[model samples]
Structures are given as structure tokens and as C-alpha cells.
Target: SFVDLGISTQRKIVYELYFAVKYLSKNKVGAIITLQRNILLDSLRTDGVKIDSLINSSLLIAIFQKSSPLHDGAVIIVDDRILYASTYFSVSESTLEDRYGARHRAALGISEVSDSITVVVSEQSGEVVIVRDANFFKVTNLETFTEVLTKELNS
Candidate 1:
């Protein structure tokens, strides 16, 4: 979702999040960083200090930039506000190869014992993968994301 589409940077950021995953499956968009070329769903806020800010799409998107110190970890957010940032989760014992990034493992790890969904935003490919319940669905647009949410909620 990082491809600049002649839109302003802020607009891209706004579109990256605000128009993307707001209609959530479990009322949360666990993470948006790119790693493992996938996004995971779900989180357990067992680590880090609780964040105090409300969810601002542009502001929150800035936190994931390479220049940001907190860019190393995942962010957990609810529909109303951001609950945690710069947080780490347990790694899954999945037998994936070493090429898989930590964020992917953590995404699977948290979903195994924590929440219900994980959204992986790939940095290199601009691919968005929603991982949860061993179901990883790569989404290309808002319509697909809405379909995923609908599928999840109805099931």
C-alpha cells in the first residue's frame, strides 16, 4: 500500500490505513509493518507501556517509517485508539525457513495464543496479508479487505 499514487504523502498514509483496515474482523488491526512479505493478525498486549493517543491515521503511519526509533516492533490498535506500540511478541515455533522475518513469526506467535487477527504489510512488495487462524489472505484493495472481514464475522 506504500506506492505513491500521485496523491500527497499524507493522503497515501491516510489511504494506507484510514481507508484500508478500519472495518476490522476482531475490532483490531494488530500490525501494519512489512516483513516476511506478509501481515499477521492478532495481539496480546502483555508487553510495553500502554499508548495514550487516539488513532490518527497519518500520525500512526509515520511511526512505521525507517527513521522512527519505534519502527523495530509491531503496533496494536483498537477501533477507537492505539493501545500499544513498539511491542514484541513471542515467536512461533513454526518450521518455516530462516528467510522468514521475525515479524511474521511474531504475528503467528501472537495469533496462536493471543488475539484473533494479524495484518502484515510488506515493505518490499506492498502486499498486505491478513493472517489469523492459520488463514493468511493477501488483500489487494479495500474491497478484498471488506470481504475478508465479512467472511470472518459471518463464520
Candidate 2:
């Protein structure tokens, strides 16, 4: 379900992340971006370290780079306001098809409990996927990605 962008800053924050994911995937970097809607995720446990920094494309790329320490975990863009890196996510217990991987499971797991959206980037295939409301979708192209993201974040 789409939530209203009640604050102007919210839309800009999500956009920064959208472009960052697009650029990073083209460069073959894997990353997880979480956008919190009406729920708070800070209470969840994570194996990754926390970094409350400002959001930016370059910072996101650096964090998601395969060689970077944060590459193994997820980067959360909270409320389109703050950037947190290397945060681990809980894996979903629900049985998924064999095609889904750990990243996809984590995205699904988080979204199942909270009103949040997760965007996952696959380094091996340079593919982007969206996980929301316990459902997943493969982003086919930049055009479709932008359209869906805009509608999802603004609606």
C-alpha cells in the first residue's frame, strides 16, 4: 500500500535512494535499501553496524561496494530522512520458491511485519527487486522502476 508523502523532504529522500540504486546496480554492486513508512524498525535486531549519516549517491555506492565492510549487510534509508548502513535484517520463515535468495527473504521478512518497502540489488546479475507487503517484483527497467517507485512513495 502507498503512503502519502506528508513531508516534502520525504519524496526527495526516496529519490536520492532510487537513483543511487540504479547507478549501483549498473556497476554490479549489491545493496539493500529500506524505506520506513508508518512503522519503526529501530527495535529489530541486526548483525551489521549502524551508521546514521546523511543520504547521498556516492555514500550509498561506497557502502554497497563488494569490498566495503558494509557490503555484507543492508543499508536503511529511514523515512527518507537518515541513512543507516550495515544493518542486518531478519529472514522470513514463510516458505518461498527456490528462486528467492537470502536478500529477498530478508526484504520480505521485514515488510511482512512493518509498513516498509525494501529495494534489493543483486551484484551477480545486476538485477533490482522490490519487496513490499510480503510480495516481490523484479524491476524490469529504469522507466518502470521510476514509475512504480514514484507511485508507491507518493500514493
Candidate 3:
């Protein structure tokens, strides 16, 4: 099934990722490594948070759940474990391609067009990362993910 990208909510999607990471870090949990899981992932809930905050935050997810307009999603595959995975999104067929190159096409496309941010986890190194202004920030370990999230949000 294909999800529709309302031209208006792209930024909201990106901010959702930022919110999750911020929450994950601010919770004072140790590095994502502390979770003992190879990967961590979450989708942006359309009705979970306020719109103003969505735009205010700086991180995003690659969504492919029931509401997404995607089919083949992506994952951070390293060391034989899916460190991170998406629901119904594909980095190849991102909708906002006009703004971003086909990196993590679908997720980043919508967010960047709306001035939002999207992050990817490196499977090989358990690094949580996000891209802003064409630069990729890789946050190694959970502690760094939180630090980098705040740092990148301000950037």
C-alpha cells in the first residue's frame, strides 16, 4: 500500500524522529548500546505530539507502517542483526526527492522539503546519525546519540 505525503507535514515527520531520540536520551538511559539491542527504531505518530514541536525538533524516522505510502522499507543490517528497521518506507523511493538526493530517499525527502531532519543508524558500529545541510552526523553509542541530537538540532 502507498502512503500519501501531505505537502504540509513533511517537517512534522522529521521532527518526530528528533523527539524520539531526545526522549530516548533525556530519559537518562545510557547509550543505545545499553539497550543490548543491535538497533532501535520508531515511527512518527501523526497525532502523538504537537505540530509546533515537530517543526521545532531536528530528527526524523523512515516510516513504513500502515499510514505510510511505501512498501519496501530499509534497515541497518550489520553483524547479522537488524540494528534498525523501517515499517513501510524505502530510502530509495523517497517522495521529497526534489530537495534531497536518493540517500534515504523517501524519509528524508518529505522532511527536508519541510526543513526537517532524518537520522540513520550505522549497523556496523551501532551509531545513530542524522543529516543536516548535506552533512551526516554519526552519534556512536547511546550517550552520543543524545548529545548529537541536541547538537544537531541547534545546527
Top of the candidates by lDDT: 2
Task: Give the alpha-carbon lDDT of every model.
Answer: 0.53, 0.75, 0.35
Please provide, for model 2 over 1-155, each residue's C-alpha lDDT reduced to its tens digit, 9 standing for 90 to 100.
13554555656665677788889778867778887777788876476666767777778888888689888777776644445678877888988776567777788888888878788887667788888899887897866776677666654
The residue ranges of model 3 lying beyond 4 angstroms of the native Cα positions read 1-103, 107-112, 122-126
lDDT of 3 by residue, 1-155 (tens): 00133423433433444465554344322111101111222342111221111122222222222343321233322222223433323233424423233334444433433333455433223235565443455554554554555444444
Residue range 52-86, candidate 1, lDDT tens digits: 45556555655665577665577765443456677
Error of 2 at 37 (Å): 1.1
On the 0 to 100 scale, the lDDT of residue 28 in model 2 is 65
TM-score of each: 0.64, 0.85, 0.33
In every candidate, how many clashes are there? 10, 0, 13
Off by over 4 Å in 1: 1-49, 97-100, 150-155
The window of 10 residues in a row where model 3 has the poorest summed lDDT is 29-38
Residue 43, model 3, lDDT: 40
Taking all chains together, the TM-score of candidate 3 against the true structure is 0.33
